[PDB]
């Protein structure tokens, strides 16, 4: 529900609106079906729709030295 609070409408409040039916998952993944405001959703595990903050890629420091 775009641009509404989870009041008037397994409920996840995002800045894109009130998302109902998607499980909020702490693990990030590559973006699949974009929702907005950093949140994407996908169908995964038994399977269900999940919502998560998308990953921007793996973290990799460079072994920089003089």
Partner 1 sequence: NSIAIPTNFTISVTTEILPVSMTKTSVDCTMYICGDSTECSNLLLQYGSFCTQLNRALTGIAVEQDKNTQEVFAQVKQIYKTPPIKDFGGFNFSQILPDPSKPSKRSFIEDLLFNKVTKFNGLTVLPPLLTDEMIAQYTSALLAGTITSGWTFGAGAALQIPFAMQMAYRFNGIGVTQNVLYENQKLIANQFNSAIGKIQDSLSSTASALGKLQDVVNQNAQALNTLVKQLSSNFGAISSVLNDILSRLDPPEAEVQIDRLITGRLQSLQTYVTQQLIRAAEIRASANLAATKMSECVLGQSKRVDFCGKGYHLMSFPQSAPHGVVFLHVTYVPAQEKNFTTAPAICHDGKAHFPREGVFVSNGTHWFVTQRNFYEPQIITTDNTFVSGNCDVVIGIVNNTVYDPLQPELDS
Ligand X SMILES: *[C@@H]1O[C@H](CO)[C@@H](O)[C@H](O)[C@H]1NC(C)=O
5 scored as a contact of ligand X (CB under 6 A): yes
2 scored as a contact of ligand X (CB under 6 A): no
| Buried b or exposed e, range 13-26, using 16+ CB within 10 angstroms | ebebbbbeebeebe
Sheet with strand 23-24: strands edge to edge = 23-24, 48-53, 39-44, 33-36
Mask of contacts with partner 1, 2-41, x by CB under 8 A?
A: xx-----------xx--------------x--xxxxx-x-
59 scored as a contact of partner 1 (CB under 8 A): yes
> Which member of 2, 8, 26, 60 binds ligand X (CB under 6 A)?
26
């Amino acid at each position: 529900y775009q641009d509404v609070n989870c009041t008037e409408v397994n409920v996840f409040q995002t800045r894109a609106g009130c998302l109902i039916g998607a499980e909020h998952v702490n693990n990030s993944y590559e973006c699949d079906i974009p929702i907005g405001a950093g949140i994407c959703a996908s169908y995964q595990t038994s399977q269900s729709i999940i919502a998560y903050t998308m990953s921007l890629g793996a973290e990799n420091s460079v072994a920089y030295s003089n």
